Amino acid sequence: PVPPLSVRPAVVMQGSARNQDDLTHKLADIVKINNQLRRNEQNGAAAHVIAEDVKLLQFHVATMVDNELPGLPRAMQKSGRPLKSLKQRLKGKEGRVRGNL
Amino acid sequence: INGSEKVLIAQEKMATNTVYVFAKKDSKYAYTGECRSCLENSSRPTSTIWVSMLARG
Amino acid sequence: AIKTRIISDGLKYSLATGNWGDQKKAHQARAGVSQVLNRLTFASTLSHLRRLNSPIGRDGKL
Amino acid sequence: KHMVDDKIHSRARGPIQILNRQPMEGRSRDGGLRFGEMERDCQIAHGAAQFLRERLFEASDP
Amino acid sequence: MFYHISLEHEILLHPRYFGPNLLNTVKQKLFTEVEGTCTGKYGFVIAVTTIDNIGAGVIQPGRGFVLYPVKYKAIVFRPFKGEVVDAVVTQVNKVGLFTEIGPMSCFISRHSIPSEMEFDPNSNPPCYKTMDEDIVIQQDDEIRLKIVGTRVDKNDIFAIGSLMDDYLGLV
Amino acid sequence: QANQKRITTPYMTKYERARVLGTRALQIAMCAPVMVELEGETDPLLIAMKELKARKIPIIIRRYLPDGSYEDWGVDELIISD
DNA sequence: CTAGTTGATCTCATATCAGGAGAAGGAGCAGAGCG
DNA sequence: CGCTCTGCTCCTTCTCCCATCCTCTCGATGGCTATGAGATCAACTAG
RNA sequence: AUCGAGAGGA
């Protein structure tokens, strides 16, 4: 399930550059690898290539809903800051439940 | 830097090349002697070496 | 071959932000170095210039 | 430096945040004051259910 | 079909109407609300018969209103597929024939009507007549039909009827 | 539940007083008839407190019991302390 | 009604260190039945 | 007489949490692949 | 405007 635009608003900066949410960047990665896997299964690809693509898709979905997986690398973004997954949006203090409800 | 006056704060750190024997209450070792070793003209991080004693029992 | 932006932008970024380390490793880097000089009164400036820091971590309750 | 004129602040139906349609944060943003968890607990102890609903539903993000 | 059913509703009331007469105001507000109304599930309500019960009026917190749940006996009209009803003809046209069944007006296309009943725009009253010209279906006539389809638009029901089935003709 | 035997307290709780006064004050503010006489009062809260002192607030308190039943008390049936 | 022209819209190509505390799993193993 | 089934202990991960509210500065953040042809369709622009 | 960091106040 890809959430609506309210959950991931594209805030406009001082100019016209529309900055997208962390969720939107992550969904972009997910759709990229999903389409890539879809074509690699549809057209010529090795079994290990499809396996690597499935592994990367798993990593993207997991880091979309939960970024602090022990051992795994954190889903990165521009400026070297990790993305804020759905879990950090409501994990504890300053999350939805404690910080907004 | 960019018109902004920036001041470097001195940062504390344990001295290097010195042997320090501590004793952690909650650990498998009774005593541990550590030495954060670093060559005179730094080229790598501090390589810490520990020489510990296993706790009795 | 010498792209001088490495040294220049690195030192400039590190002193500008305080994140002491490479700009890519912005989370392994240790912040709080290189603060904005306090210019509210002459004593504040002198003290900020004579300031020491124990990086034990404020979270620590020992 | 702490003069009252730089601290006094008030709000009555000002701007709201984009993500959650709640009052902004800060004097500079014309934001609202946080009715936090401890305030919720205090008003629960008071037994003021309509005031609690006003603060946590009707004065924040209906 | 005429029927007599008990139905439930809840209506809010402003504090101005509390007054020395209150039950009467809820009664008349219910009447002015659901008199002549229409719903696709219970069909059209011809009228409200008698108000059975007036539940306890609960003050909504934060709002001055009070909601009263009312139970009332009202008579509905629901057309059905396969039901046969007598209707009154109202308009004859080359596109079809329009007859009124109470509040609803149903249209019958020439395709559903048997082919015997011709068009006759040349006649002074637009009328349907056969080869022998024995049966005469014109405006204001009383004719039996079978209701085949129902359709609700803007909460208002409009039916469709057929004259093909045997014994369905002029009264 | 048998209205002949209501087990809850015959006193109005502080919370019942608070909510009844607020509710009746809102009703007065929304142009509801007043049950008591008025000298010059124009604040709905003052009128509601006067009605409570006079025992003339037309509200019923439905007190729910943990088992799920309830008891209906008229504001005039309860003992007003404060 | 009938073509003819003109935009939109979509599809398809070719590139390679000064935490802690608790819960759950697991493993080594002592021992008890027991076929 | 060796196998199974425990269930105890010791260690290991592993995961969760770390007062509240308020003010201010200051740095970083910006995302762009191309091009062309076939075909459908829906709207004008004449007839 | 957002995010982070830092400096502060009680």
Angle at alpha carbon of residue A63, lines to A60 and A65, rounded to 5°: 110
Radius of gyration over alpha carbons of chain D, in Å? 13
For chain C, where are the E strands, in sequence order? 35-36, 52-53
In chain D, what is the greatest distance between 2 CA atoms, to the nearest angstrom?
40
Q: Which of E36, E48, E46, E61 is nearest to E8 (CA)?
A: E48
Tokens for B28, please give them. Answer: 């498998």
Domain parsing of chain E, residue ranges: 1-80, 81-171
- CB of residue C27 closer than 7 A to nucleic acid strand G? no
Q: Are B6 and C48 in contact (CB under 8 A)?
A: no
Q: Are F55 and F73 in contact (CB under 8 A)?
A: no
For A29, phi then psi, to 5°, come to -60, -40
Which residues, 6+ apart, have CB-to-CB distance to C58 below 8 Å? none
Q: Which of A96, A75, A98 is nearest to A85 (CA)?
A: A75
Q: Which of F21, C55, E4, E109 is nearest to B12 (CA)?
A: C55
Q: Which of A28, A32, A23 is nearest to A67 (CA)?
A: A23
CA A20 to chain centre: 12
Q: Using CA atoms, how far apart are residues E28 and B52, in angstroms rounded to an integer?
A: 93
Q: Which of E43, E67, E29, E74 is nearest to E157 (CA)?
A: E43
Question: What Å resolution does this PDB entry report?
Answer: 2.8
Domain count, chain F: 1
Q: Buried b vs exposed e over E7-34: b needs ≥16 C-beta within 10 Å?
A: beeebebebebbeeebeebbbebbeeeb
| Residue linked to tokens 């300031």 | C51
Tokens for E148, please give them. Answer: 């085949």
Tokens for E54, please give them. Answer: 């007036």
For F1-82, where are the E strands, in sequence order? 60-64, 70-74
Contact D22 A100 (CB under 8 A): yes
Give the method of determination: cryo-EM
Q: Using CA atoms, how far apart are residues D38 and A46, in angstroms rounded to an integer?
A: 58
Q: Using CA atoms, how far apart are residues E151 and E160, in angstroms rounded to an integer?
A: 8
> How many residues are present in chain F?
82
Residue E155, Cβ density class (10 Å: 0-12 exposed, 13-18 middle, ≥19 buried): exposed
Sign of the torsion formed by the C-alpha atoms of A5, A8, A10 and A14: positive
Q: Which of E99, E101, E100, E121 is nearest to E109 (CA)?
A: E99
SS3 category, F56: coil
Q: Using CA atoms, how far apart are residues A14 and B33, in angstroms rounded to an integer?
A: 57
In angstroms, the Cα distances linking E86 to E37, E112, E162 are 24, 17, 12
For F14, phi then psi, to 5°, come to -60, -35
Q: Are E70 and E26 in contact (CB under 8 A)?
A: yes
Chain F partners of D47 at a C-beta cutoff of 8 Å?
Answer: 14-15
CA E21 to chain centre: 34
Tokens for E120, please give them. Answer: 């006759």
Q: Which of F1, F2, F6 is nearest to F78 (CA)?
A: F6
Contact A9 D56 (CB under 8 A): no
Subunits touching F (CB < 8 Å, at least 3 pairs)?
D, E
As annotated, the binding site of A for DNA includes 93
Q: Are A26 and A89 in contact (CB under 8 A)?
A: no
Q: Using CA atoms, how far apart are residues A63 and A77, in angstroms rounded to an integer?
A: 12
Tokens for E122, please give them. Answer: 């040349």
- Distance in Å from H16's C1' to A24's CA comes to 28
- CB of residue B24 closer than 7 A to nucleic acid strand G? yes
Which residues, 6+ apart, have CB-to-CB distance to D8 below 8 Å? none
| Residue linked to tokens 């500008």 | C16
Q: Which of B23, B53, B55, B49 is nearest to B35 (CA)?
A: B49
SS3 category, F29: helix
Q: Taking the CA of residue C6 as centre, how many other CA atoms within 13 Å lie in the half-sphere pointing to its CB?
A: 4
Chain F partners of E13 at a C-beta cutoff of 8 Å?
Answer: none
Q: Using CA atoms, how far apart are residues B36 and B18, in angstroms rounded to an integer?
A: 7
> How many residues are present in chain E?
171
Q: Are E108 and E160 in contact (CB under 8 A)?
A: yes
Three-state SS for chain A is CCCCCCCCCCEECCCCCEECCHHHHHHHHHHHHHHHHHHHHHCCCCHHHHHHHHHHHHHHHHHHHCCCCCCCCCCCCHHHCCCCCHHHHCCCCCCHHHHHC
SS3 category, D14: coil
SS3 category, D43: helix
Which residues, 6+ apart, have CB-to-CB distance to A69 below 8 Å? A62, A63
What domain range includes position F69?
Answer: 1-82
Strand C52-53, strand B10-11: pairing = parallel
Identify the residue among C36, C39, C47, C62 best suited for mutation to test binding to B, counting B beta carbons within 10 A and taking the highest: C36
- Phi-psi category of residue D13: left, alpha or beta, with phi > 0 → left and psi -120 to 50 → alpha: left
| Residue linked to tokens 């008839």 | F33
The packing angle between helices A47-65 and A22-42, to 10°, is: 160
CA dihedral C47, C49, C53, C58 (to 10 degrees): 60
Q: Using CA atoms, how far apart are residues B18 and B29, in angstroms rounded to an integer?
A: 20
Q: Are B37 and B17 in contact (CB under 8 A)?
A: yes
How far apart are the CA of D22 and the nearest CA of chain A, in angstroms?
8
Q: Using CA atoms, how far apart are residues F12 and D59, in angstroms rounded to an integer?
A: 29
As annotated, the binding site of A includes 93
Q: What is the DSSP string of E146-169?
A: EEEEEEEETTEEEEEEE--STT-S
CA C1 to chain centre: 30
